[PDB]
Design a protein around this ligand. Structure first.
Ligand SMILES: Nc1nc2c(c(=O)[nH]1)N(C=O)[C@@H](CNc1ccc(C(=O)N[C@@H](CCC(=O)O)C(=O)O)cc1)CN2
Lengths: 402, 401
C-alpha cells in the first residue's frame, strides 16, 4: 500500500514552495539531480570508517563515491583535506570542538544577537554547556565587528579556540586579522562559513582556507547542496584527529546517499553558471535592501556585502514574530531574527532576516526587487489581505522551480 | 549539466546490491516510497523547533508531516511521547545521555567485545565524557548474567544503565534490568535499534513500560530510512529530551528524512510487516541450524531474533579470514568476537550473520539450506569464479524492492 496521506502532504509543500516567495536566508532550492542522488539506494549500505578503511565489506563502490566528494570539495575550496561525513553543520562544529578542546576550556565566539550561531557559545546549546564561553559582538554605532575589541577579549581571556563566521552578520570578515589575533594567544582559529560557503566557492567572499586552522560548513544554504555538513583544512595532520572525532567519535554510519548528493552539488558549484548565480544572489540582496531602506525601513549596518540583511522593526512598533506572521499570511516566508542589542528574547525578537539565495535560484533579477519590496511593505503596514496574497502567488508562479 | 561520473557510480552500486547476498545484520533494503519521500523537496525547508512552535515561517505543512511521524510512532510502539528529529541512532543516544547525566557521571553498558555498541561506553563520546563500567556475558552460558549486572550496579552506582546491543542473539529481560536500576536509583535506557522491527511486530519483548527512555534507529529491522528515534512513556522526561535535541545538539532537522520515517511507520503498521518479521526470525533460526549441521557452532546454541553468531573454531578459521572469502564471492557478513575469544579483536573466531535484508528480497526458510551450502563452500574451498556465479544467479532470482 502507498502512504497516500503522507504524499498528499508532500504535494502540499511543493505547491507552497512554488506559490510563495521564500525569503529565508538559510534556505535554497536543490536541483533534481541532487535529489535523485539523495533518494538513491546508497542508503542501504552501512559504511562505518573511511575510504579504503571500512569496518564492513561491500564498500568498493561507496568508497569511490565518498572519495569523489572529498576530492571535489578540496578542489573547489583549495583545501588539502576534507571530511564529508558530518550529518549537519552542527555535527561538523561538534567534532571540531571535541578534537581541539577538552570540556572546561574557553571558547570564544560571536554573541547570538550580534549574529553568532547557537553552536558558537549559547548556554542552551552543547557549546555553552561543555565549554567556558567568552563572546564578542559588534559596535553599537556602526553595528560592525571591532577587531580591537576582539583582540582585547582574546588577550584577557586566552581562549583555546576562536570562532569566526555567523548566521546573521551581513558584512565581510577579515580572516587575516582574526588569525593574527589567534596567533597572539596560541589559539586555534575555526571559521564556520556555513552561510557564505557558496559565495566563497564563486570568489565573491574572502576565502578562509589559508587563514583558519579548520573550516566548517553546511553543504546546504548558499552552496545549494543537500542538507548536511562538511569540514576542511590545509593541515592534513589536524585533519586526521578530526576524522577520528567524526567516527567513531560522535557519529555512527554516514549517510552515503547524502554524500553522493554532496558530490553532485560540488560538481554544480564548479560550473561557470554557479558564479553567475552567486553574483546575482548578492546583487539581489543589495538592491532589495536599498528598496526597503527607500521605503523607510532601517537596515542593520546600512546594507550588506553578502546574501542576507536584517531589518530593525523597532521604529515600526512591530516585533519580529508579528512581522513574520503577517508576511507568511500572504505567501512571503522570512524568519523573525535577533538584531544586535535586541531587548527581546529569541522567541519574539525585534527584527526579521531576509536573504535572496532561494528566489535567485528561481530566476528573480535585481529589476524585480522594487516589486518584492512593495509587497513586503504593504503586508507590514496594511496587514494580510486576499488581494495581496494573490499578487504574491502570481509573481511567484511566473518563475520556474528547479 | 548532469554529473555523469557520479551517476555512473550509483548505477554500479545498484548492480552490486542486486548481484550479492547481504548478510550483515544491520542492513536492509528500503521501499521505493521511503526513497521518494527522502528525495523530496522537503529538504529545502528550515524547520527548527517543534510542531506549532518553530523559529521560521512557512512551516504549516511541515508541522503536519512531523506530527504524523510522531503519532504513528506512538501508535506503533505504544508510547506516550516521541521525538523523530535525531539524525541517527548515535545522535539519539547522545541527546538522552546529555539530558540525564552531567559529564563525569557513571554510565553502565554492555562491553563492546561482548556485543555492546560503540555508544555504550567505548573510549566514542560516551567513553570520553563519562565514567564507564561494562557488563558482558558468561563464558559458560554465553548469556548475560543478571547477578553480575546487579553487583556491578551496586558497586559502581551508575546514573544510567543501558540495555540493548548490536550483537546479542537472545531476548532481554527488561523487567529485571528495571529492578536493578530502581535499586540503585539509576535511569534505565534501552537502545532497541537492532530489534526495533521485531518489537513493532510483537515478536520481541517491548521495552516501553520498563525503560525510562527508549532510543532506536529507523533503519535496520524497522526497514526505514537512515535516522534516529526516541520514545518514552513519560512525557515530562520527553520535554527535557526535546530540549537536548534542539537547541542542544542539533540545528535544522532533516524533514525529508522525517517524512521518510512516517512512511516506514506506515509500512510497519500494516499486517504484512508482521508476516515479514516472522520470516526474518524463521530464516535466522533455520540458517543457524543448517550451518550447525554443517559443522559450525552457534553461540548460545541458536537465536531468538534476526541475527546469530557463528563460532568458526571447529573449522580452524578466523573471523577476518571468513569475512574476506565470503566477500570475494559476493556474500557480505562481518567478523565478531565469540565469548572469550582466544583470538584478538582485530581477528576474532566468529562472524555475525543477519537475515533482515535477504528476507526483504523474498528468501524463505526452505531456501536457507542452499545459502548455508554456499557459505560453507566459500569457507572451505575459498573463492572461485564458479562459486561467484552461483551466488550471482541466486541473488538475481530474488528481486529488490
Ligand atoms: N543570530 C542568529 N540568528 C539565527 C540563529 C542563530 O543561531 N543566531 N538561528 C539558528 O539556527 C535561527 C534561530 N534559532 C534559535 C533557536 C533558539 C534560540 C534560543 O536561545 N532559545 C532559548 C530561549 C528562547 C526564549 O524563550 O526566548 C531556549 O530554547 O531556551 C535562539 C535562536 C535563525 N537565526
Amino acid at each position: 500500500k502507498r502512504d497516500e496521506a503522507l504524499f498528499e502532504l508532500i504535494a502540499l509543500e511543493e505547491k507552497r514552495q512554488r506559490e510563495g516567495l521564500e525569503l529565508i536566508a538559510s534556505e535554497n532550492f536543490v536541483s533534481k539531480q541532487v535529489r535523485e542522488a539523495v533518494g538513491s539506494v546508497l542508503t542501504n549500505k552501512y559504511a562505518e570508517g573511511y575510504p579504503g578503511a571500512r569496518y564492513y565489506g561491500g564498500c568498493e563502490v561507496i568508497d569511490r563515491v565518498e572519495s569523489l566528494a572529498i576530492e571535489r570539495a578540496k578542489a573547489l575550496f583549495g583545501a588539502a583535506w576534507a571530511n564529508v561525513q558530518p550529518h549537519s553543520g552542527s555535527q561538523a562544529n561538534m567534532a571540531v570542538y571535541m578534537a581541539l578542546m577538552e570540556p572546561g576550556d574557553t571558547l570564544m565566539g560571536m554573541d547570538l544577537a550580534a549574529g553568532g550561531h547557537l553552536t558558537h557559545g549559547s548556554r542552551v546549546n552543547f557549546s555553552g554547556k561543555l565549554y567556558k564561553v567568552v563572546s564578542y559582538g559588534v559596535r553599537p554605532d556602526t553595528e560592525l565587528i571591532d577587531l580591537e575589541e576582539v583582540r582585547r577579549l582574546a588577550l584577557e581571556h586566552r581562549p583555546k579556540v576562536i570562532v569566526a563566521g555567523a548566521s546573521a552578520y551581513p558584512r565581510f570578515w577579515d580572516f587575516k586579522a582574526f588569525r593574527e589575533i589567534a596567533d597572539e594567544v596560541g589559539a586555534y582559529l575555526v571559521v564556520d562559513m556555513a552561510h557564505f560557503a557558496g559565495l566563497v566557492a564563486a570568489g565573491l567572499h574572502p576565502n578562509p582556507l589559508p587563514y583558519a586552522h579548520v573550516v566548517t560548513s553546511t553543504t546546504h544554504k548558499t552552496l545549494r547542496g543537500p542538507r548536511g555538513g562538511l569540514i576542511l583544512s590545509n593541515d592534513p595532520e589536524l585533519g586526521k584527529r578530526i576524522d577520528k572525532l567524526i567516527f567513531p567519535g560522535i557519529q555512527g554510519g554516514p549517510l552515503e546517499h547524502v554524500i553522493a548528493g554532496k558530490a553532485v552539488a560540488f560538481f554544480e558549484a564548479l560550473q561557470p553558471e554557479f558564479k553567475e548565480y552567486s553574483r546575482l544572489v548578492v546583487e539581489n540582496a543589495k538592491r532589495l535592501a536599498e528598496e526597503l531602506a527607500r521605503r523607510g525601513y532601517r537596515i542593520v549596518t546600512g546594507g550588506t556585502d553578502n546574501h542576507l540583511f536584517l531589518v530593525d522593526l523597532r521604529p515600526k512598533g512591530l516585533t519580529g514574530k508579528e512581522a513574520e506572521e503577517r508576511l507568511d499570511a500572504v505567501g512571503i516566508t522570512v524568519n523573525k531574527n535577533a538584531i544586535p542589542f535586541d531587548p527581546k528574547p529569541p522567541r519574539v525578537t525585534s527584527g526579521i532576516r531576509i536573504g535572496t539565495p532561494a528566489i535567485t535560484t528561481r530566476g528573480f533579477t535585481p529589476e524585480e526587487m522594487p516589486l518584492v519590496a512593495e509587497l513586503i511593505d504593504r503586508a507590514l503596514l496594511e496587514g494580510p489581505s486576499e488581494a495581496l496574497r494573490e499578487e504574491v502567488r502570481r509573481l511567484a508562479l511566473a518563475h520556474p522551480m528547479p
